[PDB]
Design a protein around this ligand. Structure first.
Ligand code: TPP
Ligand code: TPP
Ligand code: MG
Ligand code: MG
Lengths: 777, 777
């Protein structure tokens, strides 16, 4: 940036040169060229835009930045001063009338309030419908009073004010526009709101139904500088921006850069030059603005909101400010950073500086000048004053016939063709498999008129090549979605939408929780490749899915589909960790189940979607049992059987008076135990299945055991190790709920620190030993 | 890139222009300029380097890329052909002699083997000590045979071959260099090895002790394209590259870009143009190379290894290849991607293409040509043939006096000065607090001659302003580390190293597990800001810390320090989730403790560091008890008391024959219960503390209860809800280990789905109700 580096000297300043349309001129002097470049790129706004690849969007930014900030009117200037007065008035009320609020102070960063106002007002003039805000603790109550518009009485009267959500309206001072404003709930875990907020926006856009030209709900997301550079959830969520099921038309990002973490400085926080350098990975513009020049801050807010509407991409604003006090209530920040807090202590406020600048440009009259003084006193005085789930024979045949009604000149790939042919025959003959039972449920619900959404890794085809919900023609590469087409022909505007995720668990599951909150009337399901990989979304399970209703009174009906089974494929492909989910359950917080039969899975999904109980559902789904012919279901099981079963008694008992042992079991291990009973001719054993785990169906288990009056012993049989699976939960709780029951006796694998062996011959030997122990006299 | 865009035509091709030293010339024709630019930037190697900010490192890359790939010798050419022959020979043996290996095939990407060889050979010529490799499943057994150098017998004979680690030597064909080569263990969870591998390299560099000019252990890290763009752990780990405690001199990254995930294409995987676009966020160079030109691949390997040694930064290679077969053993990839697998099926191999190119440039003689044919047949034939922990009075006084031996013209900040003065007096008078007990332990061990490392968020000062292990002078900003200086004066080369992390839990804890594996003789500890935030590193707890010894036989002695207590500060600042850690324990896999007294914490840390048992330690550390004066310890407790105590019996019992109730407790709640016993004069109650949780000290608990022979009842008292804390574990296991014990009776908070309330008045009412219930007759 020095003229010496380009072989130019002081002797060239008044010579004329060809500049090729720079500043709308063909010729210019070096003195004039340097003036313009310094006015555009070196004052209170610093821009990064030349890394963008499209020529049209690079030229749009270039023309606006080199034209400069327009000179604001007197009316505009006084409106910026009134917002700064309100911001500072509220900070003073909080610090004086209440205690332990020093942690949550906005002092140093009061220009945030006029920046957020500029963006929301620009959106109202564009004609859009809503703005959804997500943010951390710092400045939250200030945003509730000055941006959402809640009364003071409402703010100051489970969980705290600093974590609950709110709604309000924003009218436009110098226009005729209105817009809704919403604030999202969040935990103390930094950046965990990022994917949840994005999902809420997509659900709201889908409900308005305005097409690709729409995208009329704006996401505004606030970060801190240390958290933005450090935590990996931030760039994981930005990567979903342009994908098919996840696009929301761009996100406006504000990073509040107060040059300190807690007791940590930027040198020990990041290996990037600026905190906002992830923008250069995704091809998006960055604006750096000085937080002590309020006219420049309101311009950057306007320019960012205009860039989002024109190009539909993400935009990043870096607001450079400082932190006046320490993070703790009684803690000295000079203890660790003494040199920085020499510059901070005993400054003038941004309000004071701006008032002095307006009263010294001589624009204002005598009457006008008195008013500016009186406004701050005004703001201060104001603040200190029996449900059946079966379908009809006719409905079932129609669902089957959807896989035959192929569009003109579409053919199926020849490994997919025989799957389609069996779906059409099965609804009369029999032999319905797991995958076809699941799709018959989601299809029936879309016909009634609901929006059904399914998302996860390789979810269109299926991980185990079992689903085939969208088919592709090998010749033409044309897509067909049979059940979506049937739904849109019944005339209740139903939809079946199926999407393939990116390789993420945290961002993926977070996005589907958000969708459930932003449309109460939708049916949403997230699937995992294997249930073993759901530990990479533990923050979302612990802080939102299991605990949200108790904390904030926020309800969800999300379905988690997690594969599970001990089939000899190693420790990272065997367990979805049942024990961990049952540890998190209390007073019916969520429903947990493991069904054995395709028809029972059908009845569970339909009960959840047609009930008034608004809590999540966790289903442990099979892998090998997907293709077992003893598991398949008849059509009368979807048409004559009315309800979902929580306990299934033994089908193969000749005489109940001869039974002496009773085995309790849950999942795929039933079919192995049943095989052995038939081979050995054991008429003294009865095998009983538990389909629902939490809540405990204790009345149905009691009825079952009452039916065998000469039973001496009760065994609990599971595949999982003795410190894993459902045994720990059941040995604690079941004896107190059924007093007359005999003492239970465990039969399982040995307790261990891993999930399962990695040697396949050891797996086969363990399984033999388990079943022999069960039948041993 | 079209000449029309720059207002130039065909009529300018033979006119001469000033080019300013391009191609080492002052003048040149447009025809010559276009030739050179196309030869340098548009053939088999594509470069991204102009985003780099330093002028010297931009010019170094520019000069090498525009000079071009050097013409390789005949000997060099035949050595590249022999490596491709070996690679393809081994793939054929695996596919024919064994089954279910189609998932793990390298067919399509055989140029990986000569790329990795080029880099390792270049490192050996630079004079460096070791190369550490981390990678996923694809190509692993090929790398074990052709790069590490294991025999076939060793490979083909718990867990599988695809997850265990190995060591070997690499000699240099045309030189006199040797270098060690190591391969790291890993789970199926993609990208979880990234932080663990980096930590292993830093531990090995620290042991060699060669200073800043050293950095002589090279990290080589292999990724897949979908995982690299999608999972957030990747950019979280790159952000640690230039930080103080974490820098290893650069990382060479290889992304194998086979243009497909599992059944998912790049369109539905990322929102970036290339998968390697995170490089532009961190200011590092990227080389894209064609995987069907083996001479270009060996050049890029050399250039990347030379760039790391000169500039000490990260470097990224994108190897563009394809995937010949499907990911499953029996699965058709044309089912989903039919158009892509029209181009793939029925191609010539990279080995075949390169042989045809050498035999058609006429360099080779008749004798030389016969040899090239016979080499592939040769490679094929070959493959198919009573420990006391106290310190002395003198050692204790010396540790105290370290906080007085300030360097010349250093003064303490005046809020830190009185802490230092009390540390010097306490070692004679009394009143030693928690923090000073912890540092007395780490200090004593550094004096004996060990390397002690402590890392975490705000760990130098402390989160609760309690530690002060490095002090800063407010006048000069000069640092002092008293205990490091005492260690280096005793002449056993001991060190006390303390570092402030970035705001990360996954990358942070991963790095400290790696350090423990790469130096068995170090004492390492990771601290969390609050124990509630450790759920963001659940992948590392589940897959490495709790399970590594059982899976792979890999041992660690890592210390986790997790703050814990119910003090009325909300649901994300109360519980470290004890219940979850005790669920993961079996057959002494790790030690779990919650000490009540500073001296007992001292004795636990020293027992762990001087034992032969090589397993992790999880300590639940206090918050409010840090400054409680009833908790402080006398000097005789560090000097006359010999061992760590697992159970502590009641100090305040006049007559043991009068006791009728016995309360068991663990942690800070002791001090509340003890206060109430004194106030009410209860000589019928005895309060007994459990300091170690797993393993269960059942012999010591039995001895304690035997001492009170007229005890009618036993209460278990905890602050946590009834489905959380240590009660679930103890109600299952303790009755079977002590048969004669009376039936236990719980006294706790009610079971719930969250951790704790968010209203402070409700917390105080709950605590009163808990203690009243305990003492109720
Ligand atoms: C996931 C997570 N990790 C760590 C913390 C602990 N924590 C609370 S506040 C804080 C500092 C954040 O600093 P920054 O993002 O720079 O913003 P500031 O509060 O200074 O505005 C940290 C690390 C947390 N709340 N959540
Ligand atoms: C954390 C995690 N998430 C998901 C998976 C499931 N998974 C196994 S292989 C695979 C595909 C990875 O594709 P890519 O990284 O492009 O490499 P390729 O195997 O095609 O070489 C996935 C998603 C996993 N193993 N770990
Ligand atoms: Mg900050
Ligand atoms: Mg790939």
């Amino acid at each position: 940036l020095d003229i010496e580096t380009h072989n130019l000297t002081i002797w060239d300043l008044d010579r004329t040169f060809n500049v090729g349309g720079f500043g709308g001129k063909e010729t210019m002097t070096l003195r004039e060229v340097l003036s313009r470049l310094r006015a555009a790129y070196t004052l209170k706004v610093g821009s990064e835009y030349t890394h963008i690849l499209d020529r049209d969007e690079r030229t749009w930014l270039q023309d606006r930045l080199e034209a400069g900030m327009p000179k604001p009117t007197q009316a505009e200037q006084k409106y910026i001063l009134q917002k700064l007065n309100a911001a500072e008035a509220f900070e003073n009320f909080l610090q004086t009338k209440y205690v332990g609020q020093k942690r949550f102070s906005l002092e140093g960063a009061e220009a945030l309030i006029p920046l957020m106002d500029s963006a929301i007002d620009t959106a109202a003039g564009q004609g859009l419908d809503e703005v959804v805000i997500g943010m951390p603790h710092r400045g939250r109550l200030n945003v509730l009073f000055n941006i959402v518009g809640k009364p003071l009485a409402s703010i100051f009267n489970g969980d705290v004010k600093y974590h609950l959500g709110s709604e309000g309206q924003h009218l436009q001072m110098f226009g005729d526009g209105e817009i809704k404003v919403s604030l999202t709930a969040n935990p103390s875990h930094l950046e965990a709101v990022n994917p949840v907020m994005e999902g809420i926006v997509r659900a709201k856009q889908d409900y308005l139904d305005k097409g690709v030209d729409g995208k009329t709900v704006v996401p505004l997301l606030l970060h801190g500088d240390a958290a933005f550079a450090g935590l990996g959830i931030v760039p994981e969520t930005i990567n979903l921006a342009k994908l098919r099921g996840y696009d929301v038309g761009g996100t406006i990002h504000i990073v509040v850069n107060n040059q300190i973490g807690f007791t940590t400085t930027p040198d020990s926080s990041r290996s990037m030059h600026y905190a906002t350098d992830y923008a250069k990975a995704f091809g998006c513009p960055v604006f750096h603005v000085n937080g002590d020049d309020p006219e420049a801050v309101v311009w950057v807010g306007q320019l960012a909101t205009e860039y989002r509407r024109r190009f539909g991409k993400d935009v990043f604003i870096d607001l450079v400010c400082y932190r006046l006090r320490g993070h703790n209530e009684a803690d000295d920040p000079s203890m660790t950073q003494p040199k920085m807090y020499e510059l901070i202590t005993g400054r003038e406020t941004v309000r004071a500086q701006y008032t002095e600048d307006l009263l010294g440009r001589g624009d204002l009259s005598n009457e006008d000048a008195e008013a500016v003084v009186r406004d701050f006193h005004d703001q201060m005085e104001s603040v200190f004053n029996g449900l059946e789930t079966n379908i009809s024979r006719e409905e079932l045949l129609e669902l089957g016939q959807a896989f035959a009604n192929t569009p003109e000149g579409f053919n199926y790939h020849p490994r997919v063709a025989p799957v389609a042919k069996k779906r059409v025959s099965s609804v009369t003959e029999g032999g319905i498999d797991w995958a076809w039972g699941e799709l018959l449920a989601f299809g029936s619900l879309a016909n009634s008129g609901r929006l059904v959404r399914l998302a996860g890794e390789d979810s269109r085809r299926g991980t185990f090549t079992q689903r085939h919900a969208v088919a592709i023609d090998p010749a033409t590469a044309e897509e067909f979605n049979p059940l979506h087409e049937l739904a849109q022909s019944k005339g209740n505007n139903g939809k079946f939408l199926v999407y393939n995720s990116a390789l993420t668990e945290y961002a993926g599951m977070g996005f589907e929780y958000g969708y459930s909150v932003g449309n109460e009337d939708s049916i949403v399901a997230w699937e995992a490749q294997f249930g073993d990989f759901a530990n990479g979304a533990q923050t979302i399970i612990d802080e939102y899915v299991s605990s949200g209703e108790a904390k904030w009174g926020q309800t969800s009906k999300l379905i988690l589909l997690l594969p599970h089974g001990y089939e000899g494929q190693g420790p990272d492909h065997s367990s979805a960790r049942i024990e961990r989910f049952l540890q998190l359950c209390a007073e019916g917080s969520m429903t947990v189940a493991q069904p054995s039969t395709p028809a029972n899975h059908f009845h569970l999904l339909r009960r959840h979607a047609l009930s008034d109980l608004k809590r999540p559902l966790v289903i442990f789904t099979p892998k090998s049992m997907l293709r077992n012919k003893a598991a398949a279901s008849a059509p009368e099981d979807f048409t004559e059987v009315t309800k979902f079963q929580s306990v299934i008694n033994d089908p193969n008992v000749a005489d109940a008076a001869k039974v002496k042992k009773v085995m309790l079991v849950s999942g795929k291990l039933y079919y192995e135990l049943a095989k052995r009973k038939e081979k050995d001719g054991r008429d003294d054993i009865a095998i009983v299945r538990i389909e629902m785990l939490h809540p405990i169906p204790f009345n149905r288990i009691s009825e079952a055991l009452a039916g065998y009056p000469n039973a001496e012993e009760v065994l609990f049989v599971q595949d999982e190790p003795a410190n894993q699976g459902p045994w720990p939960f059941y040995q604690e709780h079941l004896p107190e709920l059924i007093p007359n029951m005999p003492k239970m006796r465990r039969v399982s694998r040995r307790a261990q620190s891993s999930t399962a062996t990695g040697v396949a011959k050891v797996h086969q030997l363990e399984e033999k030993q388990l079943i022999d122990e069960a039948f041993e006299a």
